[PDB]
Amino acid sequence: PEVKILVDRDPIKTSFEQWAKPGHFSRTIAKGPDTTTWIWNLHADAHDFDSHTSDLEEISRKVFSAHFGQLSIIFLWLSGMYFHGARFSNYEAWLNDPTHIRPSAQVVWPIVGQEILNGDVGGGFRGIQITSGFFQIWRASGITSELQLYCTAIGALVFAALMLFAGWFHYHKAAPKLVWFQDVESMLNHHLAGLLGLGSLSWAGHQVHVSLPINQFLNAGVDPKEIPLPHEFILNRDLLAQLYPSFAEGATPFFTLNWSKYADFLTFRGGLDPLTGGLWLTDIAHHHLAIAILFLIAGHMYRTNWGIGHGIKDILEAHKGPFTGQGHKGLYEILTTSWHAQLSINLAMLGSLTIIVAHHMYAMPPYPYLATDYGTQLSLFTHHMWIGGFLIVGAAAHAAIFMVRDYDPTTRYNDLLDRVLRHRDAIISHLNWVCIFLGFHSFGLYIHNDTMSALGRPQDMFSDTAIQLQPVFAQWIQNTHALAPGTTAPGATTSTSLTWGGGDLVSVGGKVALLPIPLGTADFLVHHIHAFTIHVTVLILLKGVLFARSSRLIPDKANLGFRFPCDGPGRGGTCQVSAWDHVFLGLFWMYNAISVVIFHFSWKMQSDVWGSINDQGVVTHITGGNFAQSSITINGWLRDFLWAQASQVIQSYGSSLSAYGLFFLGAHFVWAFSLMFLFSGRGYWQELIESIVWAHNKLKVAPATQPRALSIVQGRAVGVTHYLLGGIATTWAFFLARIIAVG
Amino acid sequence: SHSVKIYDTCIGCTQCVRACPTDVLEMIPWGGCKAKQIASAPRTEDCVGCKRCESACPTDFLSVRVYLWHETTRSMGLAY
Amino acid sequence: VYFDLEDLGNTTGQWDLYGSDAPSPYNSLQSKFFETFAAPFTKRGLLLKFLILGGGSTLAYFSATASGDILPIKKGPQLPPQLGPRLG
Amino acid sequence: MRDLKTYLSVAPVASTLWFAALAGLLIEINRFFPDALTFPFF
Amino acid sequence: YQVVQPINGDPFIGSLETPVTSSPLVAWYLSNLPGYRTAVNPLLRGIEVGLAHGFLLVGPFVKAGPLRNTEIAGQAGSLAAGGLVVILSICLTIYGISSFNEGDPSTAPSLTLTGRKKQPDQLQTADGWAKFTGGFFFGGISGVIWAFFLLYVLDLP
Amino acid sequence: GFTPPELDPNTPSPIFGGSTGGLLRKAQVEEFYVITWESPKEQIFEMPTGGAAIMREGPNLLKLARKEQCLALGTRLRSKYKIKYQFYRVFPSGEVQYLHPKDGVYPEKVNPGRQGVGVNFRSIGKNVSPIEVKFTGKQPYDL
Amino acid sequence: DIAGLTPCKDSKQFAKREKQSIKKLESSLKLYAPDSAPALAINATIEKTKRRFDNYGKQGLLCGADGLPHLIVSGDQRHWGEFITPGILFLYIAGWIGWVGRSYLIAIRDDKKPTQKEIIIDVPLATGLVFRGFSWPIAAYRELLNGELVAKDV
Ligand code: CLA
Ligand code: CLA
Ligand code: CLA
Numbered sequence A: 001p002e003v004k005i006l007v008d009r010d011p012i013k014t015s016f017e018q019w020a021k022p023g024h025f026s027r028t029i030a031k032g033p034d035t036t037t038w039i040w041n042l043h044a045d046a047h048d049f050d051s052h053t054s055d056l057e058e059i060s061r062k063v064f065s066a067h068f069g070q071l072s073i074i075f076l077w078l079s080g081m082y083f084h085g086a087r088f089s090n091y092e093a094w095l096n097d098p099t100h101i102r103p104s105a106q107v108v109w110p111i112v113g114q115e116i117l118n119g120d121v122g123g124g125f126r127g128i129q130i131t132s133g134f135f136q137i138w139r140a141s142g143i144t145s146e147l148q149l150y151c152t153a154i155g156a157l158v159f160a161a162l163m164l165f166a167g168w169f170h171y172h173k174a175a176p177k178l179v180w181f182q183d184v185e186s187m188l189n190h191h192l193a194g195l196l197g198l199g200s201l202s203w204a205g206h207q208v209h210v211s212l213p214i215n216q217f218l219n220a221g222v223d224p225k226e227i228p229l230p231h232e233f234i235l236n237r238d239l240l241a242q243l244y245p246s247f248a249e250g251a252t253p254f255f256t257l258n259w260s261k262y263a264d265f266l267t268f269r270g271g272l273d274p275l276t277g278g279l280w281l282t283d284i285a286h287h288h289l290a291i292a293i294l295f296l297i298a299g300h301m302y303r304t305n306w307g308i309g310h311g312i313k314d315i316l317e318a319h320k321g322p323f324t325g326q327g328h329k330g331l332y333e334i335l336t337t338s339w340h341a342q343l344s345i346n347l348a349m350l351g352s353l354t355i356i357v358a359h360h361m362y363a364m365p366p367y368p369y370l371a372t373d374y375g376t377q378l379s380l381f382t383h384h385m386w387i388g389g390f391l392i393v394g395a396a397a398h399a400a401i402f403m404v405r406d407y408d409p410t411t412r413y414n415d416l417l418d419r420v421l422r423h424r425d426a427i428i429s430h431l432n433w434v435c436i437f438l439g440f441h442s443f444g445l446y447i448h449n450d451t452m453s454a455l456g457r458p459q460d461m462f463s464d465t466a467i468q469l470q471p472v473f474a475q476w477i478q479n480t481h482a483l484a485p486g487t488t489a490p491g492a493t494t495s496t497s498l499t500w501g502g503g504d505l506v507s508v509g510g511k512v513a514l515l516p517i518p519l520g521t522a523d524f525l526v527h528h529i530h531a532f533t534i535h536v537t538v539l540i541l542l543k544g545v546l547f548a549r550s551s552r553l554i555p556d557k558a559n560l561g562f563r564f565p566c567d568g569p570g571r572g573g574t575c576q577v578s579a580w581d582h583v584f585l586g587l588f589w590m591y592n593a594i595s596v597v598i599f600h601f602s603w604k605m606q607s608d609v610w611g612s613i614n615d616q617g618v619v620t621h622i623t624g625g626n627f628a629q630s631s632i633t634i635n636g637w638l639r640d641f642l643w644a645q646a647s648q649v650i651q652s653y654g655s656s657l658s659a660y661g662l663f664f665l666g667a668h669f670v671w672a673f674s675l676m677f678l679f680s681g682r683g684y685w686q687e688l689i690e691s692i693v694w695a696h697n698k699l700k701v702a703p704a705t706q707p708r709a710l711s712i713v714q715g716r717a718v719g720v721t722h723y724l725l726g727g728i729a730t731t732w733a734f735f736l737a738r739i740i741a742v743g
Numbered sequence B: 001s002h003s004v005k006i007y008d009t010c011i012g013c014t015q016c017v018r019a020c021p022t023d024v025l026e027m028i029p030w031g032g033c034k035a036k037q038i039a040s041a042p043r044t045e046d047c048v049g050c051k052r053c054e055s056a057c058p059t060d061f062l063s064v065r066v067y068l069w070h071e072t073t074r075s076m077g078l079a080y
Numbered sequence C: 001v002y003f004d005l006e007d008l009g010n011t012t013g014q015w016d017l018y019g020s021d022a023p024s025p026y027n028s029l030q031s032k033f034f035e036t037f038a039a040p041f042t043k044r045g046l047l048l049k050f051l052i053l054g055g056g057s058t059l060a061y062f063s064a065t066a067s068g069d070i071l072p073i074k075k076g077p078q079l080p081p082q083l084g085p086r087l088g
Numbered sequence D: 001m002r003d004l005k006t007y008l009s010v011a012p013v014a015s016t017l018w019f020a021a022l023a024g025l026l027i028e029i030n031r032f033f034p035d036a037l038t039f040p041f042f
Numbered sequence E: 001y002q003v004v005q006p007i008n009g010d011p012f013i014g015s016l017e018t019p020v021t022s023s024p025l026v027a028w029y030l031s032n033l034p035g036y037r038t039a040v041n042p043l044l045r046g047i048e049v050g051l052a053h054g055f056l057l058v059g060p061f062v063k064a065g066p067l068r069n070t071e072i073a074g075q076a077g078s079l080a081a082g083g084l085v086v087i088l089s090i091c092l093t094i095y096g097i098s099s100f101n102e103g104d105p106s107t108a109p110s111l112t113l114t115g116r117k118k119q120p121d122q123l124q125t126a127d128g129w130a131k132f133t134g135g136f137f138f139g140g141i142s143g144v145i146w147a148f149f150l151l152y153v154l155d156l157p
Numbered sequence F: 001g002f003t004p005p006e007l008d009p010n011t012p013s014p015i016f017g018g019s020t021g022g023l024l025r026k027a028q029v030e031e032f033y034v035i036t037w038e039s040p041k042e043q044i045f046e047m048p049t050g051g052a053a054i055m056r057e058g059p060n061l062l063k064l065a066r067k068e069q070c071l072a073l074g075t076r077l078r079s080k081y082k083i084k085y086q087f088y089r090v091f092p093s094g095e096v097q098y099l100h101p102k103d104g105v106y107p108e109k110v111n112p113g114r115q116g117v118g119v120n121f122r123s124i125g126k127n128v129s130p131i132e133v134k135f136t137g138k139q140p141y142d143l
Numbered sequence G: 001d002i003a004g005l006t007p008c009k010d011s012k013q014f015a016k017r018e019k020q021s022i023k024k025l026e027s028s029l030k031l032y033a034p035d036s037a038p039a040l041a042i043n044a045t046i047e048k049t050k051r052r053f054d055n056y057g058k059q060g061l062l063c064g065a066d067g068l069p070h071l072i073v074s075g076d077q078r079h080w081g082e083f084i085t086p087g088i089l090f091l092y093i094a095g096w097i098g099w100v101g102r103s104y105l106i107a108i109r110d111d112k113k114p115t116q117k118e119i120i121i122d123v124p125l126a127t128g129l130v131f132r133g134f135s136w137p138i139a140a141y142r143e144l145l146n147g148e149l150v151a152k153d154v
């Protein structure tokens, strides 16, 4: 009842003896291989901790150390990034001419002619243009010299060492206890106020002391070497007052509540700074301060050891109505017992958050000169979209895993979940009908438009010029956003984003940064396509989750496990009934959704936003506003998008972009390679390996580890893995080549 | 309905009867093997064809054989 | 009871959930109007022949007597013919 | 120590060390003798 | 207190009772639709269903068809609605031919939600369905004619 | 000699709110099944069709749509709890057919009153080639 | 010459490819300073290009109408360096690999767990067997004559 620190000493000895024993964690795998299937199982069950043991404490300690190892690897990755920015980059040249220099941080060795990939990136540098956007981040933070990036890389290496050591420590030495992990109130309190609150406050402290002044000097055109060091703004406050006058007071308005003085460097002007194209740094610092205060407050909701505060158990149990019975009672016991339930929730939320990040970073460019680096923006958007989609599919997978393994109404019951299970049929049937209706009333419109345009009837299509389907709701919403500053937002000087407010076109260095985005029949059709694809993905995954235990076809499916091939050719055929195969198909459908999403983004930005601006204000977009007429047709998507914009990747040979031309075809290859696995079954392959084994045994060269074709589940896993890799890498090469050439 | 047959290679381990999810297999007394028992399929009208019995037979080759035949409501696993 | 080996219609839910069983709300005269004028259409075999043949002849009439002002296929090309890549 | 050497003899680690040594050798061969579509020494 | 209850008190019948399923407004409204008037000559119920659907079908065909903007003949697009009624009257006809035989009784439930015995709806009989198809056709073509009969003083004609 | 217990209607059924996985028109016009068991106390058990139900103390009767649902529930009644169970088939006429345990002994336990059905007295590889049964209604395994 | 081809030392398209390639690299060179590191890199690539083209033309490579070295694998003794000689070198290396791996599998086939030495390599045994492939065409040929290479009745 009293939250406190609880660990055990030396639970597991540090020795290499278990290193030399493959499959030590599993009791069936530890005997060594009789056939080759063993080799695969060792990797498939490598991280399935709750199948290695049933003790929740061992599982929690393993998970803790795995988190520490992941943090070590992420810190090592960041160390590499900052070190490459310091040692093999042209960041100092990009800092003087950000509008002409191409950001590059990788230089290849000259061995087999690959030095052609070291292309002219400007600033007297031959390298590979980077789209990660680290240059924009390092500029926004105020970094100028390579020495600061060196020191950041060294600090990241030290932190990777710290994380690795802590991972060893909290498993082999002082390893925490189960109740320690289960102190959810204390943990949420420290993550809201200690982690997020103090983190936002620390970053706001950096931004008001380094980012704002150094970036003022960078905007003014001062040479970065002639710019004062950041710590010189912490000693002589005259330097800070000459840029932001309120720093001459000295925390006095903060304590006396004269905060109106701080409006010089803590503003609410919104929009974009027209010199850099990013959000006003004063606004971002003010934002981080507000976020810090909000999270520092929110980290006090949950009781711990001093009576005051909430207990999540009471809050859950108190929320029950006439439709859901005694709902929420029992959820606190579920979410404090099952790791997979927490993982499902957090994967869903983190993936949706990544998607929200992808939208918010394009519509509100946070870093200077990011909005005009079209390659960096496109790459960031697409990457975050893929991350979010994958994480949501994983949420589905782990929800199904919890259903199969941690669900038991006789011990940890919940009324809401039981009620959901008692009408899974209605839920799935209704989602099925919604998916059919959306498939007809989105893609069927595209087929209608294709058939009308082919028959010489352009007025019988669904177009901005013919049968119009205007997204009136979204148009009215963005209009209400445009008129909000000065009315329903008096403190706001301009619009929340530039895509709202009419007019106010921001351009940087001859290229546009942002302008009001049109919304027409094409946008309507594409948004309905997105809704439909999301719905079908949700249908697949949720239907897999709800029917994980039982169904009219197999009433004992839970006994077969979470990951099993089938249950025989009987009942007409029972292939792909496990929840694992539902995740397997949801992978394909998440791909099919996210691909259309990112293609929509690419064509929209290249047609109605991105382009070149004249001296007199004439903006010509990368494609001549062809989105309204061409994207309302499948043939238009085939011709005016793929066939036209793949030119750069099919012409990149003999230039620094030829690596993208190679990856294009290689990803085509692996994508088609997956089709061998997805279209076939392991019986034929085993019968082939039989004759091959005959051939080997004829020459006294057959292995003891008897070769065996991949398992059915492994066949599907390899198939979907290669399919996803091929498709995503093809789109990656295509996007990068196109946007780096025409950007 | 699906046809199920038991061959005299059966050793009488009663594993096909334990794995059967619709109670099609039985263990009858016999004199051929050591356990004094062999399998029989007297209720193939309820057989669904899952071949869960064949997955559990230790005989090489199998002693239970499920030959998928004419589909019925019972063999298709329909609750409707 | 809910399980009764006598009446299995009540045991297995063979009920009429939304059947009214009330007398007719359609007044007389009106019903006799429809029962005498929709009388020959209530022979399913005769209706099937009447629908197929009548509908097919109706379709054949409006297709054979089509108009160029309504269908571009009957109006034909109004422009002089084009010239192929090499041939006519 | 003996357990550490037994780990280094496992299939992936032996493969990496063997293929790394092989990759480095072929790189130096194509570094001192680049291109070469033929066997020129006859 | 709870809102969702098993279907007619039996939890092992695959359904539930909800405000959408079991509610006085829904129960009365469905009990007063011609398809659920289990004691009325199916010819008349077909007339009503045919009149309602034939009347409704004219709108979409006229306002969305190919001749929609050629106002010279677009109002005659009710022919398409009438043709669909013909096609649907075939679908209705061929359905009963396969479902019910001449001498077969009714397949409708002969019970009530309260257990009492009931006379089965004659719609699930060969002659009953034949009257419904004939009624749906007669009301159908009448609904299309009556809908096309009106044309003016409407905001979407 | 064994005598199968007759199906006694009006036997209590477990406490359950209802689910969508229950009976359909197949139970009305085709067939349905009924499993019965004794049980010592009031417990919770997972339903092979939906969520959870409260197993009543004393005799229990549960009607399902498929036979496999009955044996699956019975196997769990015999594993998690220690409960004997029987189940029958019910045709729309009202007739009842006893199914399992047929002999009153479980099928995995040898019982002397059982006769062989479909037992071929040869190695599985001693079946004949399909040409030798061509144009006949035979199969190489029916013999 | 053979198959209508002309030797690359005589082909004009071959020399035009060398010209255009070097001039393309020089066009990239004018952008950078003479003392720059990209300049020395581009100059080294130009020298490497001259060396490559000169070596191809010197060793009797035949060129087509495209100015690209075509290889003749019919066995003509003027071009054994294009296939037969490197192919014999490959077959020596491939036989070495297969023979050493075969010697390893034979040596561990009588172990208590032969699968143990297949997923955990016996490096001492391997290091002792890697040099038997040096004489693999002999040891294999003798095992062919003595009936030791092929398992009897399989
Ligand atoms: C692009 C798709 C694709 C590809 C590449 C293949 C390739 C192959 N198929 Mg296949 N197939 C496909 C689609 C494909 N198939 C589809 C859609 C179907 C319908 C289901 C089939 C059905 C099918 C059948 C029924 C059979 C094959 C067979 C084969 C193999 C023939 C042997 C051969 O040619 O040598 C090799 C050819 C290759 C292309 C191998 C390329 C890969 C090399 C080795 C890459 C080298 C690795 C390199 C180091 C990369 C590093 C990777 C790193 C991550 C470790 C071959 C590997 C036959 C077979 O098994 O042969 C015995 C066989 O019977 N296929
Ligand atoms: C203000 C206190 C505090 C802070 C800052 C953190 C911070 C963190 N926790 Mg943590 N936690 C806390 C209190 C705190 N926790 C309490 C009271 C409990 C319940 C007893 C937990 C239980 C808990 C669990 C079960 C897990 C975490 C995890 C994490 C990491 C999440 C990954 C991430 O966000 O990457 C961001 C990276 C950073 C912000 C870098 C800063 C990291 C600094 C150096 C750590 C300092 C905070 C630490 C608690 C201080 C003690 C260390 C000291 C003795 C040396 C993160 C670094 C996860 C994890 O283990 O990740 C490895 C995880 O599994 N926490
Ligand atoms: C924080 C996120 C997270 C975490 C902690 C877990 C954790 C776990 N998952 Mg899970 N999952 C996640 C996200 C996550 N997952 C997401 C986002 C998805 C959607 C794709 C899934 C879908 C998923 C499935 C379908 C399954 C799991 C399973 C598991 C369990 C076993 C993992 C294992 O050992 O596999 C071993 C890991 C490997 C064998 C590596 C495979 C190689 C990958 C797939 C391809 C590599 C490509 C690479 C990215 C780029 C190419 C490089 C290459 C050329 C060299 C484990 C507890 C399995 C389970 O049994 O559940 C209990 C299970 O079957 N997960």
Ligand code: CLA
Pocket: A431, A432, A433, A435, A436, A437, A438, A439, A440, A443, A444, A447, A536, A539, A540, A585, A588, A589
């Ligand atoms: C181009 C290939 C293709 C197509 C067309 C579809 C189509 C469909 N899939 Mg599918 N899928 C595919 C590939 C494809 N899939 C692949 C490769 C996989 C493996 C990963 C899957 C896995 C998958 C799953 C797991 C599921 C689906 C589902 C669905 C259906 C969603 C409901 C819907 O949209 O209704 C609308 C119908 C369409 C969009 C098809 C085109 C209809 C046209 C426009 C109308 C033309 C009508 C015309 C009058 C025809 C009459 C002509 C006459 C003379 C014959 C839909 C019909 C889901 C489902 O079952 O539905 C809920 C579902 O669960 N798919």
Ligand SMILES: CC1=C(C/C=C(\C)CCC[C@H](C)CCC[C@H](C)CCCC(C)C)C(=O)c2ccccc2C1=O
Pocket: A676, A677, A678, A680, A681, A682, A685, A708, A709, A710, A711, A712, A714, A715, A716, D015
């Ligand atoms: C091709 C295919 C196979 C065969 C695929 C196999 C056997 C993959 C294994 C091939 C690798 C290359 C074997 C591993 C080789 C070892 C790494 C040792 C190599 C030695 C060095 C070169 C490393 C299946 O097993 C299968 C199963 C189910 C559905 C479809 C399919 C399917 O399509």
Ligand code: SF4
Pocket: A570, B004, B016, B019, B020, B021, B022, B023, B024, B025, B046, B047, B048, B049, B050, B051, B052, B053, B054, B066
């Ligand atoms: S196939 Fe399945 S249902 Fe049929 S006898 Fe074998 S185990 Fe029983």
Ligand code: SF4
Pocket: B006, B009, B010, B011, B012, B013, B014, B015, B016, B017, B038, B039, B053, B056, B057, B058, B059, B062, B063, B064
């Ligand atoms: S599984 Fe095979 S060996 Fe065992 S009892 Fe059944 S038929 Fe006999």
